[PDB]
């Protein structure tokens, strides 16, 4: 494979070699794994070649026959490899799911899949539960029935690993997904019928907590005002307004809903009446009364919003305040080996974080007696974060397996993520952590140093900075950096640390975690790493990244304020490390991590392809663009170039040290740094 | 006994230090509080440290 | 200003264009230029009006009249304007911006829209017009030199060095040697093939001069074509004799003391009419008139609140 | 309220550990008695009975007193601290004073100005002597930030190696390469960093340029032994025996014996081992190896017991600071 490569002559020879290897040793995991991987790659190569040739009747039938001939051995080998490995079968399981969803509609392939499912153990599918649930509504009924049967089996054993995603799918806007989710849930109820109801009520009440009616009205009025005044989209304005009134038609259910109705609902109904009069007549004087009422109630709720510092359960949702000693386990805490930690009680008070999105701070009490804090995110998808967390788990496992990485104690800090809806969801709250921006601000306030000193110097030297050309921006940025001492982070690390013995360990952990996360983010194409988006632990010192909204070079692609920085390595972090700079722990740790990942490129590639080819996450790609298949293929090819090292120069393959050196030079380059948005804090 | 200890250590083999690893506030008070508040804090901490255990039976 | 045979216009981030006097060094008048700074100042060969390149707008100010409003404000552009050219006829004005689209402007025509568009991949950093008035040199942030023919549109793309942003490129009036300079600080020199009708214009790499260690800003040949001044972020303007490409005179504005950081960049170069003197702009807010042979500040221009980023010079009679 | 303070400061008549311990106790008790804060002063009676009470409250009492002092008694106290640190240095008092200095550094008051530069060099020396390597690394990094010197880089590499941070030492070496060129980089840096190939190249070039010297030749021999090229090591040993002084002879003897053992020349092995001093762990080890080769089992067992007796001290010293 290394020398000849992949082509028509190579495949039979490599296949016969691996088949002989399997024959001489049945029990060897590596032989079966390599055999299955080779067959899968052969299938992909044949599909790509036929796509390139025929598209650009009989040939289609011949291709189908060849693919069917190569598919079944791949499936059987993957199942056997899963059985043998027993613990590190995530890559093989995901390959199984890919083959199942791509070619399972064929009766022979489906028979192979059902035979493997019968042969394989149930516990393995806990890793790929989300990938299974991503394809609940597959148009092919043959695959769908097997998926539903497998999910019924999963509900039978370890039901806790399936309740949350089933509950999320049940409330889906599309009819087929929610229908199949309810069809699985009715079968699951005959087992317990209690876990399902508890999950349903918890999900509904948590969704109610995450987004309140007044907040929904606030955002809807913002969107409607924008549409009407900028785009003159009256029809779109009405379309945005109507679901809020439809939700009003349900009527109040809690004390907060009753108070909100008594306050605003009469004005809202009057404005809706005016809108209906406008719809039946078409008069500006009819719509202006509704607009005046909307703006009045909008001003009232805007004034009210800052006063909403904290939320109590008794007003927002007494249903949760009623909950006691539920069998329902803490979200993101169930483990097939560990004892189930079911929820004991919910704290009556939720401290809403005063942010743009206003996330709540929910804290649960477990059956074991340990608090579990969570953040209630509103109007933002978490499935992307779920896949990111799964990838981080795989990376942690790979780093644990490696001897050198384990020796250096390299790991990615990860927090439990539990989606609840397309807009709302649950995030595990990591303790003893705070954003880099907060630490910088606190240190500068303590030292009486102006918080925005660098930007102020830039504006003083050049008031037209944003409109300067590239070289002028470079000159201004260099002048600002030179006239500022960028040792704030290291100084505050030394001051915060109790003793130098703890200080050095914290600095070492910070350096190693930062290097690991930088390399992983570059491979993942994670962007928008502004100082508020990454948090520093105050005890271990490990760097933690959150808000994985932008992925796969989205920041580079977007035309407004594009980012040329693969990963944040600004001079503040550089000074925070050893006095020597990046050449010490950081660069060597990056070498080790890149070597480990390039060694295991297959597993990370499979995990990435799983949720890149996922239809539920292709909307981000379409928003990035300006079809779907070419975009996903290009993204996967870019990831492949990153892993192999052919990203910088397609013709020339790059070794790990040179690739890391180029990454560091690019990330630390002043020319690439000054293109960043000011809020990204390049000077920091 | 020193010879026996060294001999048994050698017989057991030089364990890899990582294998050994896997086999197994007052300054913060200064950093947080000002001096006027720090002095009672550290004083109370030390007095509590003495307060526990049998050294109390003497002090 | 216009009546004076010597015109020296200086402008920067202070939104003002100041016309000093070479004999005295006194700011004759200032012109307001709001909404942005200026990226390039150029005097038309006719000397009727000067041209100031800013951000998203191209302004032209009268040279004879005093305190005029912007005569022509060519709008419809974005992503700054890197530099501006001018046909010797005075009919066509050549511009390039960071939108990776060079544009050609007909001054005589009243149409606001440009006439010819040459689009490339990377943002354009410099544009230089060949003395033959038939070929246009276009730079880019990827370092690929484009030789856009004004008659056949046959652009030849040459990249002296991969993945280095080219900053400036100029050709001597005799069309003997062409110098190009990138952010690395190297001075790439191309011998020009004697082809006008043939349009061969083959570039023969003669010498890659390590002109500067840091970012190099701008290069330009002397009218005698024997001297080559080279600016950079090193605060040093280096003068190379064309025959030998050796540093005959280095114009530096360093403090002469280690206890001084970031004095200010130097991106100004203008030979005198007889190459005896040289005008240099810099970020120190102080343009300086140097002596070529000795290397001393014959006259110094001061009064700019913010950094000086452009210049204008014309000794045409 | 500074008379007994001055008497405790300018005593400098301690010739034993207990004398300095009693001096520290008296200083702490006087600080508690003279403490401006009543809460600290109330603990003086308890600290008299219980030493750890005084020890834990030492930093706060020192901070309060130093705030009280009007910049002259501060100078006297600083001079006394310098005298105590430099002269008759004792590990317990040294660590207590280092903890006090760190506590002052954390405080908003500022580091204690000791013999200028806040005594960074002295604090680093004391931290290295007392095996508090984290403080030594911090102070050496601060001294580096003040100004980088090749000696500072050497000390930093030594500290990192003593702190089990090979990557940090490699980064220091990379910085040295980038900034100081090559001449300033001694091969000892690679030797400590275990960059044996680079150390060998540096030794080869220095021996080619500079006339052959015992130190460079010994370093090259050490690099060869670490690499394991026994043939070249034995060639060098045989070539230079009579041209070698007795001190350099004994220093060679261990590596020469190792090379002979690697090559199996037992006659040369015996010749070299006889040159190795008996009071070295390696000497006893190689004598025992020779006894095993000659089947002198009783003498071999005796020599192994002697080697254990010698290694007692080394193991005790190393095991004191981590495994």
Residue numbers in the entry:
A (entry chain A): 1759 to 1814, 1867 to 2436, 2492 to 2549
B (entry chain A): 880 to 903, 933 to 967
C (entry chain C): 8 to 324
D (entry chain A): 1261 to 1583
Per the authors:
pmcMechanistic target of rapamycin (mTOR, also known as mammalian TOR) is an essential serine/threonine protein kinase that responds to nutrients, growth factors, and cellular energy to promote cell growth. mTOR nucleates two distinct complexes, mTORC1 and mTORC2, each characterized by specific subunits, targets, downstream signaling pathways, and functions. mTORC1 contains mTOR, regulatory-associated protein of mTOR (RAPTOR), and mammalian lethal with SEC13 protein 8 (mLST8). RAPTOR binds mTORC1 substrates, including the well-characterized substrates ribosomal protein S6 kinase 1 (S6K1) and 4E binding protein 1 (4E-BP1), through a five-amino acid motif termed TOS. RAPTOR binds the LST2 TOS sequence to present LST2 to the kinase catalytic site in mTOR for phosphorylation of LST2 S670. mTORC1-dependent phosphorylation at S670 leads to monoubiquitination and stabilization of LST2.
To investigate the possibility that mTORC1 binds multiple sequences in LST2, we solved the structure of mTORC1 with bound, full-length LST2. To characterize the binding of LST2 to mTORC1, we performed cryo-EM single-particle analysis on mTORC1 in complex with full-length LST2. An overall refinement of mTORC1 in complex with LST2 was obtained at 4.02 Å resolution. Interestingly, density representing LST2 was observed only in the RAPTOR TOS-binding pocket, suggesting that mTORC1 recognizes LST2 solely through the TOS sequence. Our cryo-EM data suggest that mTORC1 recognizes LST2 exclusively through the TOS sequence and that RAPTOR binds the LST2 and 4E-BP1 TOS sequences in a highly similar manner. To determine whether LST2 is an mTORC1 substrate, as suggested by the LST2 TOS sequence, we performed an in vitro kinase assay with purified mTORC1 and full-length LST2. mTORC1 efficiently phosphorylated wild-type LST2, but not LST2-F401A, in vitro, indicating that mTORC1 phosphorylates LST2 in a TOS-dependent manner. Thus, LST2 is phosphorylated by mTORC1, primarily at S670.
